[PDB]
Structure formats: C-alpha cells, structure tokens
Amino acid sequence: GRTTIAIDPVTRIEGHLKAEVVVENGKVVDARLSGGMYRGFETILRGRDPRDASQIVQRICGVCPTAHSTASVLALDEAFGAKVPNNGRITRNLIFGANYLQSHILHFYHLSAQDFVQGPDTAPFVPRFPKSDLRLSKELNKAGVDQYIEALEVRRICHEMVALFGGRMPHVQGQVVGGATEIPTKEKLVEYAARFKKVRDFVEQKYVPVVYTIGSKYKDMFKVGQGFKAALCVGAFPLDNSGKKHLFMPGVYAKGKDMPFDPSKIKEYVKYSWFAEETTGLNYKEGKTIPAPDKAGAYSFVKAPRYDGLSLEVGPLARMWVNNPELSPVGKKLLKDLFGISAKKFRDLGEEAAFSLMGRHVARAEETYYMLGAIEGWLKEIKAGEDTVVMPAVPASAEGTGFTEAPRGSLLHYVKVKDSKIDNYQIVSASLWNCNPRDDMGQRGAVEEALIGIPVDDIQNPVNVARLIRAFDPXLGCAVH
Amino acid sequence: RPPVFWLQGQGCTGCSVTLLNSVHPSIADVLLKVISLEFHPTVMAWEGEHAIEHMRKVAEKFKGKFFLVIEGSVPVEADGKYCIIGEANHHEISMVDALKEFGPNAAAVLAVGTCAAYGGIPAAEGSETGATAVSKFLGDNGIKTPVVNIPGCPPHPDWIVGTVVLALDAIKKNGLEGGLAEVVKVLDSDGRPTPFFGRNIHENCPYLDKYDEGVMSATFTDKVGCRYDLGCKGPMTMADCFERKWNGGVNWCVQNAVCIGCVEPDFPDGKSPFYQA
Ligand code: SF4
Ligand code: SF4
Numbered sequence: 001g002r003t004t005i006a007i008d009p010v011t012r013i014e015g016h017l018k019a020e021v022v023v024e025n026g027k028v029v030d031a032r033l034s035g036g037m038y039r040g041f042e043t044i045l046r047g048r049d050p051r052d053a054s055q056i057v058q059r060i061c062g063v064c065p066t067a068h069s070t071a072s073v074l075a076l077d078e079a080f081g082a083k084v085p086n087n088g089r090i091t092r093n094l095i096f097g098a099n100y101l102q103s104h105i106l107h108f109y110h111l112s113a114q115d116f117v118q119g120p121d122t123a124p125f126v127p128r129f130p131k132s133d134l135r136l137s138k139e140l141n142k143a144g145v146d147q148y149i150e151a152l153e154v155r156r157i158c159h160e161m162v163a164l165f166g167g168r169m170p171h172v173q174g175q176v177v178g179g180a181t182e183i184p185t186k187e188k189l190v191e192y193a194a195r196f197k198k199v200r201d202f203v204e205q206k207y208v209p210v211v212y213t214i215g216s217k218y219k220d221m222f223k224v225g226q227g228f229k230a231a232l233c234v235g236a237f238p239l240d241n242s243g244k245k246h247l248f249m250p251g252v253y254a255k256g257k258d259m260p261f262d263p264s265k266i267k268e269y270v271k272y273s274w275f276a277e278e279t280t281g282l283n284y285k286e287g288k289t290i291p292a293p294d295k296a297g298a299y300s301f302v303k304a305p306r307y308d309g310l311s312l313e314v315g316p317l318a319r320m321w322v323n324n325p326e327l328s329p330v331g332k333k334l335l336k337d338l339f340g341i342s343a344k345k346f347r348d349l350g351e352e353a354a355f356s357l358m359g360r361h362v363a364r365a366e367e368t369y370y371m372l373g374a375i376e377g378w379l380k381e382i383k384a385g386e387d388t389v390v391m392p393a394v395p396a397s398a399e400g401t402g403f404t405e406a407p408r409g410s411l412l413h414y415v416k417v418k419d420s421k422i423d424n425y426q427i428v429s430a431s432l433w434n435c436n437p438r439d440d441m442g443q444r445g446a447v448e449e450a451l452i453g454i455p456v457d458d459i460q461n462p463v464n465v466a467r468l469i470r471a472f473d474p475x476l477g478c479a480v481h
Numbered sequence: 482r483p484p485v486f487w488l489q490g491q492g493c494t495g496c497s498v499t500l501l502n503s504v505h506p507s508i509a510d511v512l513l514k515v516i517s518l519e520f521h522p523t524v525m526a527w528e529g530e531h532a533i534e535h536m537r538k539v540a541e542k543f544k545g546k547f548f549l550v551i552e553g554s555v556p557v558e559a560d561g562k563y564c565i566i567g568e569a570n571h572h573e574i575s576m577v578d579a580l581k582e583f584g585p586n587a588a589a590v591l592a593v594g595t596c597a598a599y600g601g602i603p604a605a606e607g608s609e610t611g612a613t614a615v616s617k618f619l620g621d622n623g624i625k626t627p628v629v630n631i632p633g634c635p636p637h638p639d640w641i642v643g644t645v646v647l648a649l650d651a652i653k654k655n656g657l658e659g660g661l662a663e664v665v666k667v668l669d670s671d672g673r674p675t676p677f678f679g680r681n682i683h684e685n686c687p688y689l690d691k692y693d694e695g696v697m698s699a700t701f702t703d704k705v706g707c708r709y710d711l712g713c714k715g716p717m718t719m720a721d722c723f724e725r726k727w728n729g730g731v732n733w734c735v736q737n738a739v740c741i742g743c744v745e746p747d748f749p750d751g752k753s754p755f756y757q758a
C-alpha cells in the first residue's frame with residue numbers, strides 16, 4: 001500500500017533540501033527532511049578578529065544576510081561592551097526592516113506563487129507537473145503573473161532601500177559592532193522614503209489582497225499542515241536603548257499556552273544529523289560543530305534544536321501568533337467578504353487555520369503590512385546628522401549573544417573571545433528551527449511534523465508535499481551554515 | 482536559443498539575488514529571447530528528479546551548446562557528500578558528480594561569485610570540506626571546457642550581465658568557437674573580464690587625495706577622510722565599484738564603510754582582518 005516519494009532538489013526555496021515522505025491512503029504518514037549541503041561557518045570563524053564576524057556570517061545566506069549581520073553585531077556589542085547610539089539603533093532598524101519587505105515579497109511571488117499560479121510557456125516556468133492543481137480563474141491567474149512581474153521591481157527597490165544606509169545588498173557593509181557606519185542625511189532619508197512609499201503601495205494594493213484572494217480559492221489548505229502547533233519568538237527590532245521594548249516581543253506558545261522565552265532551555269541534538277555523536281545535546285554556549293558525513297542513521301546536515309524538549313516552529317506565523325497584533329485593514333475586510341470571518345487580531349483566525357499551509361502565507365503577508373508601520377515610525381524617529389556609531393576596542397576575553405528575528409524566524413549568534421580572537425562561534429538559525437531532522441528521542445522537526453496528514457491523492461503529481469514546505473519559506477543555507 | 486543550467490554548489494544564493502537586482506536594459510531580453518533558463522533550483526517551476534531529468538534531456542539535445550552557471554564552491558572531501566544537489570531514481574548526485582557529468586558537454590562555464598571562481602569563504606581557513614574553485618576542479622578532473630570567472634561576493638549584477646553581453650557580441654561576430662577565443666583575450670590572469678576588473682579601486686578612489694595627504698578617518702561615520710586606517714582594502718582590489726556603485730547607484734562600500742576586497746582570489750583570508758590595515 002505505502003509509497004515512498006523522494007524529492008531532491010526541493011525547488012523554489014533557498015538552498016539544498018531533500019524531502020522524503022511516505023504516503024498511505026492519499027495522505028502523508030511519515031516524513032524526513034535532509035539538508036544536503038554544509039559549509040561549516042562555525043569552524044571557519046575560529047581564530048579571526050571578532051569584528052570580521054559581521055562580514056563573514058552574512059555569507060551564510062544572500063537572501064537574509066542582514067539578519068545574520070544583525071545577530072552578529074548584537075553579539076559583538078555585548079562582548080565588546082559597546083553602547084550603540086540611539087540614532088544608530090534606528091538606522092540598523094531601517095537597514096534590516098527594508099529586507100523584511102524584500103524577503104517576504106521574494107518569498108510569496110518568486111518562490112511560492114507558482115504553487116498556485118500557472119506561468120507562461122517558457123523556461124523556467126515550464127515544464128512542471130501535468131496535474132499541478134492550479135485553480136485560479138483566467139483573471140486571477142493573470143493578476144498573479146502581472147504581480148510576479150511587478151514584484152521583481154519592488155523587491156529590487158527594497159534592496160535600494162537597504163543599500164542607502166547599508167552600503168550594498170546582498171551583504172551590507174553598514175552594520176558593525178557599535179552601531180551603523182553611515183549617518184543618515186536629510187537627502188538620503190528623502191530617497192529612502194520615496195522608495196518606501198512605492199513598496200507600501202504594492203504591499204497594500206497588490207500583495208496582501210492577493211494572498212487572501214488566492215487563499216479563498218484554496219480553503220482546503222487551511223485545514224492541513226498544523227504540525228505541533230508550537231511556536232517560538234526570541235524578539236527583534238529594539239524600540240529603545242535599554243533592551244526592553246521590541247517590535248516583536250519574545251515568547252513561546254505550545255499546547256495552547258503562552259510562556260516566556262528562556263534561551264538556557266535550547267539544546268541541539270545530532271543523532272540524526274551528520275555530526276560527531278559526542279556533540280549531541282549541547283546548548284549553544286557550549287556548542288560544537290564536528291562534521292560526520294558518514295555517520296550511520298543520520299540524514300541531514302541540519303542539527304535538531306529543541307526548546308525545553310519541544311520541537312517548535314518559527315517565522316511570521318510564530319511571531320504574529322505570539323505577539324497577536326491587530327490585522328491589516330485589507331485583511332479584516334477580505335476575511336469578512338471572502339471567508340465570512342469577523343476578525344480583529346491575528347489569533348482571531350483560530351489556532352487551526354493560523355497553523356496551516358495557507359495560514360503561514362497569510363501570516364507572512366500580514367507581517368509585511370505590520371513592518372510598514374514600524375518603518376514609517378522609524379522614518380519619523382530617525383534624526384538626520386546624529387552619530388550612529390561608537391568605536392570600541394577589541395576585548396582580549398569576552399562573550400556575547402545576539403538575539404533577533406530573521407524574516408524566516410528566530411536567529412541567535414553566540415561568540416566567545418579569547419586572546420582577542422574568536423574561540424567559539426555558534427549559530428542557531430530560523431530554518432534550523434523549522435527544517436531540522438528528528439532529535440535523539442525520535443521527535444520530528446517542525447516541518448517534518450507539519451507534513452503529516454498532507455493530502456497526496458495523486459502519487460504521480462504529489463504537489464502538496466513541496467507546497468507545505470514552501471509555506472515555511474525554508475532557507476537551507478541558514479539551516480546548516 | 483541556447484539553454485542555461487544554473488547549478489548551486491556551496492553557495493549562499495547571493496549571486497542569484499544580486500542578478501535579480503539588475504537594471505540592465507538587456508536583462509529581460511537575455512532571459513526571454515537569447516537564452517533559456519532551463520534549470521535553476523531557486524526559481525524554476527518543477528522539482529526533484531523531474532527537474533534533474535529535464536536538465537538532462539535538454540543537455541543531451543544541446544550537447545556542446547548549453548552554458549553552465551555555477552554559484553558556490555565544489556567540495557571534494559568525503560566523496561563529495563558535503564554537497565548533494567539532487568537525486569535521480571534513488572541515485573544521489575553530488576556537486577562533484579554534476580560537474581563531472583555536465584562540465585564536459587557545456588559550451589562554456591561561468592563561475593559566478595568568489596566562491597565558484599576562487600573558493601571564497603567555504604575554502605577559507607578553518608574549513609573542512611575541500612571547497613574547490615570551478616576551474617581548479619575541472620582541470621583536476623581533465624575537463625578542458627572554457628571557464629570565465631565573474632567574482633565578487635556577491636558580484637555586481639552589471640558584471641554578470643555585462644560578461645554575457647561581451648560573449649554575445651563576440652559569438653555573433655566570430656561564431657561559438659571563435660567567439661569564446663575572443664573572450665579569452667580580454668581576461669586577466671585570474672580569469673576575470675578586464676572591462677569590469679581591469680582597474681584598481683584605490684587608484685580611482687574619490688578619497689585618494691585624502692590618502693595622499695595622510696588624512697584618515699578614525700570613525701566610520703567620518704566621511705571626509707580616507708578609510709585606510711579603518712581597514713579599507715581598495716589598494717589591493719580590482720573592480721569598478723567606484724564608478725557604477727551599487728544597487729541603482731545609491732551607495733558603495735567605500736562611501737558607506739570600507740572595501741573588503743571581495744573580488745580578489747585571496748578573499749577572505751588575504752583581506753582579513755577587515756577592520757585594520
Ligand atoms: S560569492 Fe559570496 S554572494 Fe556568491 S555564493 Fe559565494 S558567499 Fe554567496
Ligand atoms: S584606502 Fe580606500 S578610502 Fe583610502 S583612497 Fe584607497 S580606496 Fe579610497
């Protein structure tokens with residue numbers, strides 16, 4: 001009865017992923033995710049001037065490098081005892097916030113949209129599965145195509161926004177220990193705001209409405225992909241200089257309950273990962289990275305992070321669920337008009353629909369709208385001309401941890417400094433939380449679990465396997481590093 | 482209309498992303514009328530063994546005529562297992578095996594980005610994967626297919642598109658074989674096209690007068706002085722960023738902070754520490 005389907009490479013994600021599922025009676029009944037490429041940034045970093053980390057770590061991933069930059073400089077700030085000036089904190093938020101817009105827009109249109117929208121008869125939009133379950137009307141499919149094309153311009157403008165104070169993108173030069181390297185001028189602030197206005201218009205008028213509208217043709221996709229229904233947020237985008245208030249506040253949600261985040265409860269397991277057996281179960285402060293590509297039973301270069309034993313997911317759904325902000329005006333209206341749902345705040349979607357294949361796309365669109373308001377605020381808060389950096393000395397001995405939220409989910413970097421050089425550097429990244437293999441006790445990773453129950457009514461056209469995976473916006477470069 | 486297969490090895494996808502940032506007037510035309518992007522894991526419609534098999538069927542039809550773009554380095558340690566790029570009917574395909582298969586049959590290979598070109602970060606001190614540059618890997622395995630390096634971490638999109646344009650003109654004027662021979666003429670000793678990598682950053686820097694005067698910035702946010710003391714590697718770097726700048730001309734590394742020498746064969750180790758001379 002059972003059929004095993006292997007998909008390598010899973011495409012329209014970042015990086016190298018193999019998915020293997022077992023299908024029985026038209027549904028996925030088991031799953032394994034394999035991250036098949038390793039670079040080993042945690043060992044490459046050793047012995048370097050710690051200030052180099054904020055450049056080296058960005059090369060983990062050219063889609064989300066500002067996230068790694070941010071985590072790294074936050075770790076360095078702590079280890080160096082550097083107090084980032086108020087204006088530099090805001091400048092960092094403007095650099096990084098612009099890439100949230102870029103990344104979510106890239107994800108929905110250029111990675112995910114072909115899951116629902118039929119492209120024209122030209123590579124790379126053909127060939128594809130003969131029965132791809134593409135349900136949109138002539139008009140709606142055309143809207144998807146036109147918006148994919150427009151989004152190419154919009155995501156590029158987002159990178160212009162990042163580069164204004166960031167230097168260039170991918171791989172910014174503009175964030176360093178102690179703040180930001182370039183004070184915003186009045187002139188460049190006008191340039192940033194002009195671009196921001198165009199991005200806002202696209203997000204409000206095209207992107208958010210299209211996700212709900214496509215979602216309304218795929219209501220069945222809100223009923224699958226729940227997985228553990230457990231979420232993590234470690235906080236991001238500091239709104240003051242005392243490390244208190246953040247745009248996204250930290251918290252954990254599991255078994256229907258909200259609880260504080262305590263990073264000491266993070267452990268990384270490796271039984272099913274290609275790393276030396278003796279390195280299993282380490283918290284990141286004690287982390288070790290010893291590759292073992294021939295180890296029997298292992299199936300991924302992604303370690304298996306667990307929070308107090310729990311397998312959690314991260315990303316826009318996780319943050320929006322944990323923080324529970326008010327929904328966008330257009331979202332509220334489409335929920336009413338298309339879904340018959342009266343909703344005010346994000347959790348009004350209900351746990352079941354929020355933690356679903358389509359729910360995660362909706363969360364990402366809502367979060368993009370939410371970020372618009374934050375950037376609007378920072379553009380009013382920033383003061384042209386005010387210094388954005390301090391120049392701290394390299395300490396001989398120190399440690400630091402930087403916590404932030406990458407567009408795909410929770411990210412932390414830990415650095416230990418000895419003899420003025422990097423002694424250890426450990427990275428616990430977003431897609432690591434989502435796309436990891438089983439832990440030592442046999443508990444599946446978040447996406448592995450969310451695959452359970454996914455419908456596969458046609459083994460010759462098993463499109464929902466990768467649709468589920470793409471809803472999580474996986475980045476296997478980040479997950480493995 | 483020749484096919485292009487874009488293979489990712491130990492890459493970060495930043496070389497793909499930088500290309501997505503192109504405002505080159507020829508970009509859309511290159512993708513829609515001149516070549517056909519038949520395989521690219523980040524953006525293509527199909528997936529899995531079907532995508533692999535599609536690439537294979539096209540490659541066979543266009544033997545000797547398709548182009549490879551490689552993003553990221555090629556790891557040779559542990560029998561290639563540090564980079565698996567696909568699976569065909571239960572058979573894993575490492576980056577090593579993919580280049581051994583497709584490399585011999587390509588018209589030419591573009592090694593895009595410092596990883597593919599020179600090894601880059603995955604090959605840096607502390608690495609354990611045998612991360613290898615494309616030209617070196619191919620040569621080590623007796624594969625003589627022409628390789629052009631377009632480095633940078635990431636490259637500017639103009640360097641990638643502009644190299645394609647150079648090839649296009651050359652191949653139109655002299656045919657495939659003759660054209661590639663003409664492109665070889667304008668490559669420096671590191672396999673880089675001289676139109677983009679033929680000039681030194683420092684020699685053309687707007688802050689050179691300050692360098693000469695010995696006026697050095699002591700904080701990044703001081704934009705008046707030379708960035709040399711802050712670690713600028715412009716003196717040892719061959720790229721035209723001073724001119725075209727970055728992301729629609731809105732900034733570049735030297736104005737914003739420092740140059741880290743990202744296009745150079747010794748990046749990153751030979752350009753590190755980044756924040757002192
Ligand atoms: S050259 Fe740099 S940007 Fe390109 S794949 Fe390598 S690390 Fe990424
Ligand atoms: S050291 Fe850097 S900032 Fe100074 S003149 Fe040379 S390239 Fe310009």
Ligand code: SF4
Pocket residue numbers: 633634682718719720722733734735739740741742743744
């Ligand atoms: S200025 Fe230097 S670091 Fe920046 S892109 Fe050019 S060569 Fe690379």
Ligand code: FCO
Pocket residue numbers: 061064067068406407408409410411429430431432474475478479
């Ligand atoms: N966003 C992003 Fe990249 C991932 N996953 C990080 O961190």
Ligand SMILES: [Cl-]
Pocket residue numbers: 063064065066067068099100103406407
């Ligand atoms: Cl990011």
Ligand SMILES: [Fe+2]
Pocket residue numbers: 042303426427428429480481
């Ligand atoms: Fe890690």
Ligand code: NI
Pocket residue numbers: 014060061062063064475477478
């Ligand atoms: Ni990433």
